[PDB]
Structure 1
Amino acid sequence: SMEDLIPLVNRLQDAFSAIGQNADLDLPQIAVVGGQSAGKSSVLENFVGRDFLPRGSGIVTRRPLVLQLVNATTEYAEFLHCKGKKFTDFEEVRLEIEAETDRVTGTNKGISPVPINLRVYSPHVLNLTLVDLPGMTKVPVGDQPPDIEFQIRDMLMQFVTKENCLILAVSPANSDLANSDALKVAKEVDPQGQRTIGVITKLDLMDEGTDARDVLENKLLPLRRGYIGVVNRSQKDIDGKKDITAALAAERKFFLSHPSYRHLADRMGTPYLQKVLNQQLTNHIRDTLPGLRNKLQSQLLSIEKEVDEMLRMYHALKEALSIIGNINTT
């Protein structure tokens, strides 16, 4: 259903344009959340299919980045704060985004609440909103204040409460697993797990002697989709510019030994997480379409029976209805 939905959504916007109405589908946004240093950027960029999110040492997501994807013929990017700037090199794009974060916070443990605004045009995407958010913490590191936790936490909470927010729930191993920022937020919005996949990352770095075994066996609090684990890029990995395919290879090794996950091994990996999330998205789009269709029918009728000599309506309305119908049938 995702595959057939994509083209129909663009077509629907065009019909709306002709009516001269401000009518949009308002595609739901997806937000990635997780502890400090979680691999948050890695997860998000893997879904998008591109290297464009800054990654570094220590604190990585240091400013929220609100990216709106725009269907367009040419492939390029532009910043709100950099009016008119033309790249054309996607490796350069990545670099520029990273640079802007350094601009305000430096690379010495950072933080700023001011969003970076980026528009990435592509002809193979939904007009979506994705958000990279600062890592929530429990104890201060570097020069961060004692109340670091409370500043960061608030910031990301404004995005994840939005109805229909696919949560990329990343959970850091350097914090207690039961105290998981990811699992907390994920459970709050979508308790039954139609679109929540509980993901525990960085599993190879967990402190000796702790585990979430009952929860992770899908028995303690059973979820329809269960839990899928992943092992993303480590500190050495990010430092080196280790590329996307490589990161997946490290995952395999850990999972064979961990008691809480070996029986569920066939329902593990990044790739499996991908499949589930897409399905939910489609549902929202369709639901809004019946309402419009009906309005259009009513307007036409009146003038026709008294034929007002305002025959211009006839043609405009007819067009809109056809587009709507096709999406409704799927």
Structure 2
Amino acid sequence: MEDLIPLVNRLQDAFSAIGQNADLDLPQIAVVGGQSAGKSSVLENFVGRDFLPRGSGIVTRRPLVLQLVNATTEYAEFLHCKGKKFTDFEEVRLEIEAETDRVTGTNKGISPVPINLRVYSPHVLNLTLVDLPGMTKVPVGDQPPDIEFQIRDMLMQFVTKENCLILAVSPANSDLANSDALKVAKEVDPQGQRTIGVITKLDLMDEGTDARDVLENKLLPLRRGYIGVVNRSQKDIDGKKDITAALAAERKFFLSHPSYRHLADRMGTPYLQKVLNQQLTNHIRDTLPGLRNKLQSQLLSIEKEVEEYKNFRPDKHGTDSRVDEMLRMYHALKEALSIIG
């Protein structure tokens, strides 16, 4: 898939250029759950550049479709800043925050229009993650009275797609039965074919309690199971603790907890990355046919259009962006197919 990401990118771009942005339905992974369950924190571990805004209260307010591509040098590009190469990750964070404010148009409200960000790095896996605002029940500040439903609708646009894997995130310090994540995952993926349970904040459970029943997949079983994680507290985020230290603490936590130690090797952030990648690879594998057919269809249709061409014969000027983009689309589709088996 890493081999055709280059093409699909040229594809989406040519489509966006003519204002049509195609429904490629490329495999991606979206985090769903209640507000501040720790979703952005789970996704931050796949990048480690601190640009994903985290925090209690409402922070994520727009979907962030983050494409990670393994490359030799590190840089980022936003689809809305075409032509710009970001090398400063602090600037990447500021842009996410400024863009969030610009489109939401409010202090605490949301907007379902996604922020599209691509990050090239020699430290990342090849995949697309979608960070999403957490579900709520009552509005605060300038949020609309139907905020709970706007947020749910926003998530539904992603999770109702067959190609979107679901990271159902639930915090350990709330009974699982209260999980907004599991409720939505069951509704859209009754069979659990694409739901992976993630249990965060295990370090915050009330003394004398534990999530053993949940972690052993017995309370609310999921085919893909549940993986517990322990991410940075607000103190540690403000304190600048890095991922290496947080990962060491998480390992120690699981190795030392009397209720989880027998499960340690299938717990933790590194394990989640391993499993997620495997599930994604598998999904891509069994869903490839559908993608190739989509491409074959778009190609045939485009060929019909292109067949009746002879665009600009005169000198230099006489610009025609539409034709140029149809040609970029045409060529991208063919290269995509030659790679797509």
* TM-score band w.r.t. shorter chain: 0.5 to 0.7
SS state at 1:26 partner: coil
Conserved 8 A contact 1:53-1:94: yes
Structure 2 CA distance for aligned equivalents of residues 121 and 196 of structure 1: 27
Question: 1:206-251, CA deviations, whole angstroms, 9 ceiling, x for partnerless residues?
Answer: 3567665544332344445432211112121233343322322342
Residues 214 and 72 (structure 1 numbering): CA distance in 2 closer, same or farther, change over 3 Å? Answer: closer
Q: Using a 3 Å threshold, how does the CA distance of structure 1 residues 63 and 242 change in structure 2: closer, same or farther? A: farther
Q: Structure 1 residue 282: deviation in Å?
A: 3.1
Q: Is the 8 A contact 1:57 1:238 kept in 2?
A: no
Alpha-carbon shift at residue 52 of structure 1 (Å): 3.0
- 1:309 and 1:56 map into 2 onto residues whose CA distance is 41
Q: How does 1:178-189 map to 2 (within 5 A)?
A: 178-189=177-188
1: CA distance, partners of 2:63 / 2:302: 52
Q: Decide whether aligned partners of structure 1 residues 300 and 149 sit closer, same or farther in structure 2, where only a CA change above 3 A counts.
A: closer
Mapped contact 2:34–2:181 kept (Cα < 8 A):
yes
Please give the alpha-carbon distance, in whole angstroms, between the structure 2 residues aligned to 1:201 and 1:70: 26
43-52 or 231-240, which deviates more: 43-52
**In the TM superposition, what whole-angstrom CA distance separates every residue of 1:45-76 from its partner, at most 9, and x where no partner exists?**
32245443222453221222233457888753
Note if contact 1:27-1:127 (Cα within 8 Å) is conserved in structure 2: no
Distance 2:136 2:325 in 1: 68
8 A contact 2:40–2:54 mirrored in 1: yes
Give 3-state SS (helix, strand or coil) of 2:118's partner: strand
**TM-score normalised to structure 1 length:** 0.68
What is the aligned length?
Answer: 324
Most deviating of 279-288 and 117-126: 117-126
Task: Find the residue that maps to 2:168 and give its secondary structure.
Answer: strand
Q: 1:192 to 1:257 in 2, by over 3 A?
A: farther
> For residues 330 and 104 of structure 2, what CA distance do their matches in structure 1 show?
58
Provide structure 1 residue ranges, at least 5 long, that are not aligned to the other structure. Answer: 326-330
Deviates more, 1:299-308 or 1:4-13: 299-308
Q: Secondary structure in 1 aligned to 2:3?
A: helix
Deviates more, 1:240-249 or 1:187-196: 187-196
* Cα distance in 2, alignment partners of residues 105 and 19 from structure 1: 25
SS class of match (2:8)? helix
Aligned counterparts of 1:301 and 1:145: Cα–Cα separation in 2: 45
Q: CA deviation at 1:150?
A: 2.7
Deviations 1:171-213 (A, max 9, x none): 1346443111223334445556565332210122235676655
Question: Does the Cα contact within 8 Å between 1:137 and 1:148 map onto a contact in 2?
Answer: yes
Distance 1:255 1:81, change over 3 A: same
Structure 1 residues 263 and 9 mapped into 2: Cα distance closer, same or farther (>3 Å)? same
Q: SS of the counterpart of 1:48?
A: coil
* 1:197 match: secondary structure: strand
TM-score by length of 2: 0.66
Preserved contact between residue 12 and residue 324 of structure 1 (Cα < 8 Å)? no
The residue aligned with 2:249 is 250
Q: Give the match's secondary structure for 1:118.
A: strand
Alpha-carbon distance in 2 for matches of 1:48, 1:253: 22
| Ranges in structure 2 where 5+ consecutive residues have no aligned partner | 307-323
